[PDB]
Amino acid sequence: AQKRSEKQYNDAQNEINKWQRNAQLALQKGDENLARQALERKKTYTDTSAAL
């Protein structure tokens, strides 16, 4: 259960990191609105990660 949920906790960071691609690529389109919506996901994953 530790190994499993640790993999999931790592994968939440892996998601945060991948969602930097989302925010960065949105900025490379000029889509601030979409970059904010990526930052909301990175925020919600950060919140999740603490609890785990």
């Binding site: 925010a23 960065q24 900025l27 601030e32 970059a35 904010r36 930052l39 909301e40 925020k43």
Partner: peptide, 12 residues
Amino acid sequence: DELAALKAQMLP
């Protein structure tokens, strides 16, 4: 706070 991070991230 997302704007503050975003404006720094878009700046470079």
